[PDB]
Write an enzyme that holds these catalytic residues in place. Structure first.
Site, short mmCIF file in Angstrom:
data_model
loop_
_atom_site.label_atom_id
_atom_site.label_comp_id
_atom_site.label_asym_id
_atom_site.label_seq_id
_atom_site.Cartn_x
_atom_site.Cartn_y
_atom_site.Cartn_z
N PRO B 328 -8.94 -11.28 -14.27
CA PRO B 328 -8.21 -12.17 -13.37
C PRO B 328 -8.58 -11.93 -11.91
O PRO B 328 -8.52 -10.80 -11.42
CB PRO B 328 -6.74 -11.83 -13.64
N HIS B 356 0.93 -12.22 -9.33
CA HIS B 356 0.11 -11.31 -8.54
C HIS B 356 -1.06 -12.04 -7.90
O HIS B 356 -1.29 -11.94 -6.69
CB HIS B 356 -0.39 -10.15 -9.42
N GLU B 357 -1.81 -12.79 -8.71
CA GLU B 357 -3.03 -13.43 -8.21
C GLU B 357 -2.71 -14.55 -7.23
O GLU B 357 -3.42 -14.72 -6.23
CB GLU B 357 -3.86 -13.95 -9.38
N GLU B 384 -3.61 -5.95 -2.01
CA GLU B 384 -3.00 -5.64 -3.30
C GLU B 384 -1.52 -5.30 -3.15
O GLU B 384 -0.75 -5.50 -4.10
CB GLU B 384 -3.74 -4.49 -3.99
N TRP B 459 -12.90 21.44 -7.89
CA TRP B 459 -12.31 20.23 -8.45
C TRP B 459 -11.15 20.55 -9.37
O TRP B 459 -10.10 19.89 -9.32
CB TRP B 459 -13.38 19.42 -9.19
N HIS B 487 -14.85 4.59 -9.66
CA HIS B 487 -14.87 4.46 -8.21
C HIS B 487 -15.79 5.49 -7.56
O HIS B 487 -16.46 5.19 -6.56
CB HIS B 487 -13.45 4.58 -7.65
#
Ligand SMILES: *[C@@H]1O[C@H](CO)[C@@H](O[C@@H]2O[C@H](CO)[C@@H](O)[C@H](O)[C@H]2NC(C)=O)[C@H](O)[C@H]1NC(C)=O
Ligand SMILES: *[C@@H]1O[C@H](CO)[C@@H](O)[C@H](O)[C@H]1NC(C)=O
Ligand SMILES: *[C@@H]1O[C@H](CO)[C@@H](O)[C@H](O)[C@H]1NC(C)=O
Ligand SMILES: *[C@@H]1O[C@H](CO)[C@@H](O)[C@H](O)[C@H]1NC(C)=O
Ligand SMILES: *[C@@H]1O[C@H](CO)[C@@H](O)[C@H](O)[C@H]1NC(C)=O
Ligand SMILES: *[C@@H]1O[C@H](CO)[C@@H](O)[C@H](O)[C@H]1NC(C)=O
Ligand SMILES: [Zn+2]
Lengths: 195, 596
Positions: B328, B356-357, B384, B459, B487
């Site tokens: 979407p 949302h969209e 967002e 980490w 990401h």
């Protein structure tokens, strides 16, 4: 009973670019103005000084029909005392304008998927237009201080830009065909009455 | 003519040229995403290549107008953005090396395959193969196999590439006069030359850490409650005082704890609100879903969708032949062209996704009048955040009863409120330590505070300390576990998911106050409130034209990111969690590990 050739202006196959706006002098004929104002085919029909309501009971020496294409959000610039790219650089109406401005959406004719680059407008100019002035020059605009030598470059832009009308544009970006009727009154024959 | 006047004229030319080339590229991109053909891939690439080439040329031309001679701030914002990072500040060779590195890491992630022992042909990709295991499996060994195999075979490939990626990114950032690549990423929040609204790049680190300290008590109690419930399910695998094993968190990384709901639901006899059956009973289709979403935004005073939106969008899956990418998305093609691409099903989830969209669309329409370069959210977290608050109001029982999907006889008890808030916290609160810790590690790596031979040691030290999560298998420096997330390996900044989460509850609290909502914040519905819609629109129309600190102040009355509305939203759960953990240990020891 010579009928004024309004069909050749409103129903032309192609309209002019606003920077090179077309002018058609109307003379020695009978104009039925009420047909246009009471047709319900135009989105904009605004008259200044004169009244659209049954003022085909008047006589004028000469009537001028100016036609061009602009985008929908720029139709508001075809009016007395307006500013913007169209009013300042392409087509300027005087403060004491006496006439009517007629416009309608032409997305079905002047748009094409992929873009219709036939209609242009002037983006840059050294100064604003006088009322009813026309500038069709293609001189490269000098934005800086170095001479442009007649070609595009740094601070040297081609003054004319293209709308690129595509069918999927929003209404404010869709093409609109505009007809501007000027009603002139000289101490003169007054040849365009039109019952 | 002065330098500023030249820049104004230059930006005047750029806007009209950029709008035309951007529309051709978006139109070509839309045609592929809705109709997948080889011809459409080439047309998208051709249009896209012209758009990128135009931006590269215009960025070089923009650099010939020095920012030091411009006083109009709106002009300087547009000039600076196009000055972007320049048309590669590095050499052509290093830019070529970096682009190949980025492409190889992306290809490794999207094509990385893991094969089960004893059958080298039964192999699984991350999507959907490995993701299905990490989200649905309850078997300890199957989850461990997927978690370790992904990092041992795909992450190890990414380790040498990421090391060279850090070096080249820092060289690019330092030549752009940033301290490092992390400092470059923090520049999205930088504001200069606006008295009372300025914001420095280093201030973001301070504000993120300061607000995270106030999140810690809520996360600690959520961590303790989740650990206790998991300890009941896996008694021999979980210590009552230790960190949660990394492979038992609901997805490949523990980014969200959403899929832990079944094992951690407080009251497992009270079902969820699922209006999907009611939608099917009333013969709803996709157009009805988007019509209802449109009515929601109109009710608060926002404009309806344009005629082109209904004619040009793709609100249903095309068919059996013509294929489309069903993720979407809300599309702002420019020239007044606004569309939504969505393969809508008749479900409650897609009903909320449409809200949302369409929230994205309303944002896009509101700042359409801005110059081209300022047509975006105030910062990376605004867009967002606006989209999320639409699904908050639309999902409440109050809103679902007003549109006829939830029966009026249905009444909500405090047990269903705890169930709902716990499910919200697993997704919203659970990701905050994960998001902050991941970006802190990348900031320190870019800063040079973590040597190469201690990347994975650091980490997992930070995972244990900040997130309360422990690796199930020791990992040496041949691993690149952070790069196993999309990401990191695809070169996307991650702090945006932390700041956006805090923005959305700031927005919702302010809008609900303007809507005169009474009761807990999580039950609010801004429907029928033109006061709330006006307050939101005052920010939406700004785009990027104003500092994000000012744009935030338009909605909430404060100039900075604040965590109190987030805690206000989850207060009923926080009170319940603290009572639940009276018999449990709260906090974690960092030395326990499942591999002893
Ligand atoms: C920055 O420049 C813009 C445009 O170059 C200025 O906005 C213009 O303001 C005049 C009136 O002063 C209007 O007639 C124009 O239509 C405006 N144009 C645009 C694009 O907004 C703006 O005022 C300048 N800002 C400052 C602080 O000087
Ligand atoms: C243009 O054509 C239509 C249809 O033939 C006609 O009704 C209209 O009157 C024409 N326009 C003018 C100005 O005569
Ligand atoms: C899909 O794309 C092809 C060209 O790749 C085109 O001929 C066809 O009409 C398109 N179909 C639809 C439904 O858009
Ligand atoms: C949107 O609302 C306007 C009234 O402000 C109306 O004229 C227009 O037809 C509506 N369009 C749609 C698609 O609902
Ligand atoms: C919104 O207002 C309408 C009346 O205009 C009312 O029927 C409806 O129940 C209201 N819904 C909400 C959620 O306030
Ligand atoms: C729900 O309310 C009842 C009545 O006060 C209370 O006894 C119960 O503990 C509440 N449930 C919670 C707070 O989870
Ligand atoms: Zn979104």
């Amino acid at each position: 009973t010579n009928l004024c050739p309004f069909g050749e202006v409103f129903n032309a196959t192609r309209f002019a670019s606003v920077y090179a706006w077309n002018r058609k002098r109307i003379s020695n004929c009978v104009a039925d103005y009420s047909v246009l104002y009471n047709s319900a085919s135009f989105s904009t029909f605004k008259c200044y000084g004169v009244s659209p309501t049954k003022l085909n009971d008047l006589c004028f020496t000469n009537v001028y029909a100016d036609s061009f294409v602009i985008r929908g959000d720029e139709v508001r610039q075809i009016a007395p005392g307006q500013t913007g790219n169209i009013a300042d650089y392409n087509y300027k109406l005087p403060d004491d304008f006496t006439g009517c401005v007629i416009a309608w959406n032409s997305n079905n004719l002047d748009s094409k998927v992929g873009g219709n680059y036939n209609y242009l407008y002037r983006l840059f100019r050294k100064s604003n237009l006088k009322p009813f002035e026309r500038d069709i020059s293609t001189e490269i605009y000098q934005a800086g201080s170095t001479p442009c030598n007649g070609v595009k470059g740094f601070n040297c832009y081609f003054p004319l830009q293209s709308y690129g009308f595509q069918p999927t544009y929003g209404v404010g970006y869709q093409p609109y065909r505009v007809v501007v009727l000027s009603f002139e009154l000289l101490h003169a024959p007054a040849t365009v009455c039109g019952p | 003519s002065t330098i500023e006047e030249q820049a104004k004229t230059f930006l005047d030319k750029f806007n009209h040229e950029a709008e035309d080339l951007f529309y051709q590229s978006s139109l070509a991109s839309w045609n592929y995403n809705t109709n997948i053909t080889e011809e459409n891939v080439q047309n998208m690439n051709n249009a896209g290549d012209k758009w990128s080439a135009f931006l590269k040329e215009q960025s070089t031309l923009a650099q010939m107008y020095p920012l030091q001679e411009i006083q109009n701030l709106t002009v300087k914002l547009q000039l600076q953005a196009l000055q972007q990072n320049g048309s590669s500040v590095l050499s052509e060779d290093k830019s070529k090396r970096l682009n190949t590195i980025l492409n190889t890491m992306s290809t490794i992630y999207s094509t990385g395959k893991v094969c089960n022992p004893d059958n080298p042909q039964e192999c699984l990709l991350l999507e959907p193969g490995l993701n299905e295991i990490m989200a649905n499996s309850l078997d300890y060994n199957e989850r461990l196999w997927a978690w370790e195999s992904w990092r041992s075979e795909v992450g190890k490939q990414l380790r040498p590439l990421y090391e060279e990626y850090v070096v080249l990114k820092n060289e690019m950032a330092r030549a752009n006069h940033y301290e490092d690549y992390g400092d470059y990423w923090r520049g999205d929040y930088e504001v200069n030359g606006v008295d009372g609204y300025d914001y420095s790049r280093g201030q973001l680190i301070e504000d993120v850490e300061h607000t995270f300290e106030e999140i810690k008590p809520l996360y600690e109690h959520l961590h303790a409650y989740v650990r206790a419930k998991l300890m009941n399910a896996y008694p021999s695998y979980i210590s009552p005082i230790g960190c949660l094993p990394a492979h038992l968190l609901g997805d490949m990384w523990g980014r969200f704890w959403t899929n832990l709901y079944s094992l951690t639901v407080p009251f497992g006899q009270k079902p969820n609100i699922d209006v999907t059956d009611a939608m099917v009973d009333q013969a709803w289709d996709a157009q009805r879903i988007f019509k209802e979403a449109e009515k929601f935004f109109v009710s608060v005073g926002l404009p309806n969708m344009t005629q082109g939106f209904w004619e040009n969008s793709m609100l249903t899956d095309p068919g059996n032949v013509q294929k489309a990418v069903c993720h979407p998305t809300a599309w702002d093609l420019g020239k007044g062209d606004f569309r939504i691409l969505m393969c809508t099903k008749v479900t409650m989830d897609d009903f909320l996704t449409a809200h949302h969209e369409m929230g994205h669309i309303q944002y896009d329409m509101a700042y359409a009048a801005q110059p081209f370069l300022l047509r975006n959210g105030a910062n990376e977290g605004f867009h967002e955040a606006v989209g999320e608050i639409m699904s908050l109001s639309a999902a409440t029982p109050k809103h679902l009863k007003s549109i006829g999907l939830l029966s009026p006889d249905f009444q909500e008890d405090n047990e269903t409120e705890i169930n709902f808030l716990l499910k919200q916290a697993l997704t919203i609160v659970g990701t905050l330590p994960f998001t902050y810790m991941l970006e802190k590690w990348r900031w320190m790596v870019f800063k040079g505070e973590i040597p190469k031979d201690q990347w994975m040691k650091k980490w997992w030290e930070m995972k244990r300390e900040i997130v309360g999560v422990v690796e199930p298998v020791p990992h040496d420096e041949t691993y690149c576990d952070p790069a196993s997330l999309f990401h990191v390996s695809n070169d996307y900044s991650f702090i945006r998911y932390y700041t956006r989460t805090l923005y959305q509850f700031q927005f919702q609290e302010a809008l609900c106050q303007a809507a005169k909502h009474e009761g807990p914040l999580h039950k609010c519905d801004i429907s029928n409130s033109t006061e709330a819609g006006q307050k939101l629109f005052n920010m939406l129309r700004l785009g990027k034209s104003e500092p994000w600190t000012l744009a935030l102040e338009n909605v909430v009355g404060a100039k900075n990111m604040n965590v109190r509305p987030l805690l206000n939203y989850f207060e009923p759960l926080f009170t319940w969690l603290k009572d639940q953990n009276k018999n449990s240990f709260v906090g974690w020891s960092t030395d326990w590990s499942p591999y002893a």
